[PDB]
Scaffold this active site. Structure first.
Site, PDB file in Angstrom:
ATOM      1  N   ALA A 183      36.497  36.985  26.566  1.00 57.30           N
ATOM      2  CA  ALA A 183      37.802  36.500  27.024  1.00 57.30           C
ATOM      3  C   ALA A 183      37.927  36.804  28.514  1.00 57.30           C
ATOM      4  O   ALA A 183      37.075  37.481  29.102  1.00 57.30           O
ATOM      5  CB  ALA A 183      38.947  37.121  26.218  1.00 57.30           C
TER       6      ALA A 183
ATOM      7  N   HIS B  12      43.861  44.823  31.457  1.00 55.36           N
ATOM      8  CA  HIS B  12      43.536  44.324  32.784  1.00 55.36           C
ATOM      9  C   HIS B  12      44.765  43.996  33.616  1.00 55.36           C
ATOM     10  O   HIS B  12      44.665  43.916  34.846  1.00 55.36           O
ATOM     11  CB  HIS B  12      42.738  43.044  32.686  1.00 55.36           C
ATOM     12  CG  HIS B  12      41.266  43.252  32.718  1.00 55.36           C
ATOM     13  ND1 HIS B  12      40.655  44.057  33.660  1.00 55.36           N
ATOM     14  CD2 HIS B  12      40.274  42.712  31.981  1.00 55.36           C
ATOM     15  CE1 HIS B  12      39.350  44.043  33.470  1.00 55.36           C
ATOM     16  NE2 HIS B  12      39.093  43.240  32.456  1.00 55.36           N
TER      17      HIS B  12
ATOM     18  N   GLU C  15      41.929  42.412  27.560  1.00 54.45           N
ATOM     19  CA  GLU C  15      42.523  41.505  28.554  1.00 54.45           C
ATOM     20  C   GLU C  15      43.936  41.944  28.927  1.00 54.45           C
ATOM     21  O   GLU C  15      44.357  41.790  30.079  1.00 54.45           O
ATOM     22  CB  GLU C  15      42.531  40.052  28.038  1.00 54.45           C
ATOM     23  CG  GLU C  15      41.163  39.535  27.489  1.00 54.45           C
ATOM     24  CD  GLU C  15      39.965  39.907  28.363  1.00 54.45           C
ATOM     25  OE1 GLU C  15      40.105  39.999  29.604  1.00 54.45           O
ATOM     26  OE2 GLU C  15      38.871  40.120  27.788  1.00 54.45           O
TER      27      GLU C  15
HETATM   28  O1  LIG Z   1      34.294  39.137  27.359  1.00 58.15           O
HETATM   29  C1  LIG Z   1      33.689  40.058  27.817  1.00 58.15           C
HETATM   30  C2  LIG Z   1      32.730  40.929  26.983  1.00 58.15           C
HETATM   31  N1  LIG Z   1      32.188  41.922  27.909  1.00 58.15           N
HETATM   32  C3  LIG Z   1      30.919  41.618  28.549  1.00 58.15           C
HETATM   33  C4  LIG Z   1      30.445  40.328  28.666  1.00 58.15           C
HETATM   34  C5  LIG Z   1      29.232  40.028  29.293  1.00 58.15           C
HETATM   35  C6  LIG Z   1      28.459  41.082  29.770  1.00 58.15           C
HETATM   36  C7  LIG Z   1      28.954  42.387  29.616  1.00 58.15           C
HETATM   37  F1  LIG Z   1      28.251  43.466  30.024  1.00 58.15           F
HETATM   38  C8  LIG Z   1      30.145  42.670  29.004  1.00 58.15           C
HETATM   39  N2  LIG Z   1      33.808  40.376  29.196  1.00 58.15           N
HETATM   40  C9  LIG Z   1      34.724  39.618  30.056  1.00 58.15           C
HETATM   41  C10 LIG Z   1      35.822  40.539  30.579  1.00 58.15           C
HETATM   42  O2  LIG Z   1      35.634  41.562  31.180  1.00 58.15           O
HETATM   43  N3  LIG Z   1      37.155  40.139  30.267  1.00 58.15           N
HETATM   44  O3  LIG Z   1      38.216  40.910  30.703  1.00 58.15           O
HETATM   45  C11 LIG Z   1      34.019  38.881  31.175  1.00 58.15           C
HETATM   46  C12 LIG Z   1      32.658  38.974  31.343  1.00 58.15           C
HETATM   47  C13 LIG Z   1      32.029  38.266  32.356  1.00 58.15           C
HETATM   48  C14 LIG Z   1      32.818  37.506  33.188  1.00 58.15           C
HETATM   49 BR1  LIG Z   1      31.983  36.505  34.601  1.00 58.15          BR
HETATM   50  C15 LIG Z   1      34.192  37.426  33.041  1.00 58.15           C
HETATM   51  C16 LIG Z   1      34.811  38.098  32.019  1.00 58.15           C
HETATM   52 ZN   LIG Z   2      37.274  42.774  31.349  1.00 63.97          ZN
END
Ligand SMILES: O=C(CNc1cccc(F)c1)N[C@@H](C(=O)NO)c1ccc(Br)cc1
Ligand SMILES: [Zn+2]
Ligand SMILES: [Mg+2]
Ligand SMILES: [Mg+2]
Length: 890
Positions: free
Chosen positions: A267, A306, A303
């Protein structure tokens, strides 16, 4: 010349973007983006050209102060940078405007503006905003946003962007528009727009302190709107937790969550407009496995958190990524521990870190949680930055305790709210709390900063001394991080070691809660008035992200497993017993293989350990999720950190032997528990109440499904009867388990067809079915995967589909690592194919290769050949090339 960005090179832009005014006009064959940037010259300007990021944009026209610029003479564009020559750039506030054409319909990389089924949706983190319009696409360019979206009304009745909807209007030709104004400054990676035929659930939340009414909306396509209920409850829970633990209220009038079917990750925290992979937002008891419920809780929580740690306090630059992601994972983890009230929540994060992240940190990809350089920003999003970042963020709480941690976090928010920040800002805020806690204005956390800069997993090892006459106990502690390519010389870290001392005679605690602060390469911690030789309970809660070398006997570890108060130390003591066994049996199997022995011996599993497992399984007060961990051997990706040149066949034989040794003694216990757990595990009382989620009950199903798997591999008498009955359960975790465990029986394809029919009319359930098939312990798994490709997956570009078909299979130790290399060739073909349209997902599909240089030499060669073949594809993306170049040390 790929362009390496270096952390130490950070400098503020010579320009300022104060206001963004967007008009996004969505048409059938193209989308027109008009953008006016109200800009200025910053104090750092030195007369440079004005360079905008802009990737894949078709320029209709660009202008400065409403005068069209002429291509070639006043600007150049090379499909990635727009350069306006400085002599045409104004010396004071000016308006830059442009009209470009983009094509969401054919944007299969799912970054920028793209179409997911019938929903138009954006993904701007990290570098996606430049794929929508020109911009100085970096998080320190904070601006105000005024966004108008127009579209065909019938196709796209719901229009969403950041901020308040200030106007809605009709447009000739069946179209309509909505204008959103978002006055608070934000980086462009938090911009989002959504257009589609969305249905919603909604609720009103009243904040704890200011009593502000916040409208909560959760959106999906119409078919799945009944799956939104849990997410809405999770959002309410997340808001309440930030209020209760952190004293933090939401600041906006409305928060929208939107599910889309095609999403590269879980997400995205776009301000007021969080966008989710549908598999991390949508669930129903009938159509989701149990894991969906914890996933939605943690991703909605993540989320939401954040909004403070990332959105209100944002990043100076992308090298600070862990400041919002590690910190938000930490906040997410606190939240989920409080919400689930089960010890397995913390255990599951440790289990992830020590398998996946430890492997990364001992691989050629190893990096500190704040890297020094990058080529593809998207390759920066790693379990190191997220999950070790989270453990580094959690260590501040362990060191400070709750009261002073909360004080330090509040300093961080108050001092940086509305601004960019760096990792130093956070450490500074914690340092103020440290001073307060120590009553020592000279105390500092300077050493703590090495957790941000030093790559590699520390190894922490122990020696003990007990003087019975003196009643004096000593714990001698050593820390060591292996040199790697990032630091030749490693330095001692600030390692907090939460400890107890267990009296082996009565299992009782011997001392109060204690956190040893190890700040040197070694230290000795002495304890007086220790009446009896204790067993140390070390790194309680897994208090630092390190290899623990406890130097305890298996008798000592067994006693901790039975009697210690700390869930993690019990789980780790069990882990350590298993690891000693695995390493011993592995080497015995290996020697027999190497020496081509016609007969040989294997060391049996410790009988008192098996008795201890039995004792715990039969303890009705013990946690069912914890029990599921103790009957499960450590993950293959944890084990591989302890074996050089690991022969995966020998490891497979080793695990089989150990599982058989234990099952030969405990299968009757496993069967009896599988049966007695049925009533509470499968209770249907609340099956039609989507608000009622019982993490204990879900853990009893986990335990039942783990025991069933063990009994099915054992060919326990008449277990196929249990498998068939279990295929009739209303819970997908049960009937998908029945498919997987039926792999060992002639009924497999009967259950394959049955569960397919149960799964095929729910997009997300079908993906869970695909995962279950992919992970099935089938000798014909390669032919099955061909069947999935031809009959189900086909040419889907949906990342959930591709990941479901292929990644679970790569955990098949025997078959993915088939010595022919056929499994490596298969995944490499899928990576190269996927890379043509989605480089980020192609790099995700590289994950099996991350351990390549840890395997036996023949499999090393086989994997290396496939990644060198992938590196030679003429069309390889920058993302994939950089990943494979780093992974192969080239
Ligand atoms: O959805 C996840 C799951 N985490 C995650 C995914 C990929 C690699 C990894 F090491 C951890 N991560 C979100 C996040 O941080 N949302 O707040 C996210 C990830 C990349 C980007 Br470009 C934008 C958003
Ligand atoms: Zn995140
Ligand atoms: Mg284009
Ligand atoms: Mg290297």
């Amino acid at each position: 010349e790929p362009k390496i960005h270096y952390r130490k090179d950070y400098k503020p832009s010579g320009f300022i973007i104060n206001q963004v005014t967007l008009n996004i006009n969505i048409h059938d064959q193209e989308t027109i983006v008009r953008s006016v940037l109200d800009m200025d010259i910053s104090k750092h300007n030195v007369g440079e050209d004005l360079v905008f990021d802009g990737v894949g944009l078709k320029i209709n026209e660009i202008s400065i102060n409403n005068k069209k610029l002429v291509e070639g003479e006043e600007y150049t564009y090379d499909n990635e940078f727009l350069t306006i020559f400085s002599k045409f750039v104004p010396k004071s506030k000016f308006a830059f405007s442009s009209e470009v054409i983009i094509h969401p319909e054919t944007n299969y990389a799912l970054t920028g503006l793209y179409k997911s089924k019938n929903i138009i949706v954006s993904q701007c983190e990290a570098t996606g905003f430049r794929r929508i319009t020109f911009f100085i696409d970096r998080p320190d360019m904070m601006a105000k946003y005024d966004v108008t979206v127009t579209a065909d009304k019938e196709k796209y009745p719901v229009l969403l962007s950041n901020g308040d909807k200030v106007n809605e209007f009709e447009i000739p030709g069946g179209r309509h528009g909505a204008r959103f104004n978002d006055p608070p400054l934000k980086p462009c990676y938090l911009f989002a727009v959504v257009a589609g035929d969305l249905k919603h659930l909604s609720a009103t939340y009243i904040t704890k302190y200011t009593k502000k009414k916040v409208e909560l909306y959760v959106f999906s396509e119409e078919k799945y709107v009944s799956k939104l209920q849990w997410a809405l409850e999770c959002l309410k829970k997340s808001m309440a937790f930030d209020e209760d633990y952190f004293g933090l209220e939401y600041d906006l009038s409305r928060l929208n969550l939107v599910a889309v079917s095609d999403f590269n990750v879980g997400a995205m925290e776009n301000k007021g407009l969080n966008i989710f992979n549908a598999n991390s937002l949508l669930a129903s008891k009938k159509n989701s496995i149990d894991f969906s419920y914890a996933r939605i809780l943690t991703v909605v929580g993540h989320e939401y958190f954040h909004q403070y740690t990332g959105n209100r306090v944002t990043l100076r630059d992308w090298f600070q990524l862990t400041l919002k992601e590690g910190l938000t994972v930490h906040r997410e983890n606190l939240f989920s521990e409080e919400m689930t009230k089960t010890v397995t929540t913390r255990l599951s994060h440790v289990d992830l870190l020590r398998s996946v992240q430890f492997l990364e940190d001992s691989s050629p990809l190893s990096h500190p949680i704040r890297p020094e350089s990058y080529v593809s920003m998207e390759n920066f999003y790693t379990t190191t930055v997220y999950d070790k970042g989270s453990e580094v963020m959690r260590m501040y709480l362990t060191i400070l305790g709750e009261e002073y941690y909360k004080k330090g976090f509040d300093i961080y928010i108050k001092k940086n709210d509305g601004n960019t920040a760096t990792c130093e800002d956070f450490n500074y805020a914690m340092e103020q709390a440290y001073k307060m806690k120590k009553a020592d204005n000279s105390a500092n956390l300077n050493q703590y900063l090495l957790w941000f800069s030093q790559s590699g997993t520390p190894h922490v090892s122990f020696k003990y001394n007990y003087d019975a006459e003196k009643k004096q106990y000593s714990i001698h502690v050593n820390q060591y991080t292996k040199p790697d390519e990032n630091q030749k010389e490693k330095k001692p870290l600030f390692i907090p070691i939460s400890v107890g001392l267990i009296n082996p005679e009565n299992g009782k605690e011997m001392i109060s809660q204690t956190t040893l602060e190890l700040t040197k390469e070694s230290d000795t911690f002495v304890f007086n008035n220790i009446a009896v030789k204790p067993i140390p309970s070390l790194f309680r809660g897994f208090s630092a992200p390190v290899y623990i070398e406890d130097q305890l006997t298996d008798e000592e570890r067994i006693l901790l497993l039975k009697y210690d108060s700390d869930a993690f130390v019990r789980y780790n003591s069990c882990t350590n017993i298993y690891m000693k066994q695995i390493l011993m049996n592995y080497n015995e199997f290996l020697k027999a293989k190497n020496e081509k022995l016609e007969s040989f011996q294997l060391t049996p599993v410790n009988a008192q350990f098996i008795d201890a497992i039995k004792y715990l399984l039969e303890d009705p007060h013990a946690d069912a999720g914890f029990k599921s961990y103790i009957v499960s051997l450590p993950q293959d990706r944890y084990i591989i950190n302890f074996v050089s040149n690991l022969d995966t066949d020998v490891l497979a034989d080793t695990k089989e032997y150990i599982y058989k040794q234990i099952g030969d003694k405990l299968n009757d216990v496993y069967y009896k528990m599988f049966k007695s757990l049925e009533a509470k595990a499968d209770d249907l009382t609340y099956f039609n109440d989507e608000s009622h989620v019982d993490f204990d009950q879900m853990n009893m199903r986990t335990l039942r499904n783990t025991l069933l798997s063990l009994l099915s591999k054992a060919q326990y008498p008449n277990i196929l009867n249990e498998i068939i009955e279990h295929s009739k359960s209303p819970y997908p975790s049960n009937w998908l388990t029945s498919l997987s465990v039926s792999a060992y029986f002639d009924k497999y394809f009967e259950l394959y067809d049955k569960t397919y029919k149960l799964s095929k009319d729910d997009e997300l359930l079908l993906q869970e079915w695909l995962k279950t098939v992919s992970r099935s312990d089938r000798k014909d798994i390669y032919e099955i995967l061909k069947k999935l490709e031809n009959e189900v997956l086909k040419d889907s570009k949906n990342p959930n589909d591709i990941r479901a078909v292929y990644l679970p299979f790569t955990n098949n130790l025997r078959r993915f690592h088939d010595i022919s290399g056929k499994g490596y060739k298969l995944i490499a073909e899928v990576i190269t194919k996927t890379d043509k349209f989605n480089p980020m997902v192609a790099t995700q599909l590289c994950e099996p290769f991350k351990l390549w240089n840890k395997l036996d030499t023949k499999r090393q060669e086989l994997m290396l050949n496939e990644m060198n073949t992938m590196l030679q594809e003429p069309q390889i993306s920058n993302n994939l090339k950089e990943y494979l170049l780093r992974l192969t040390n080239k």
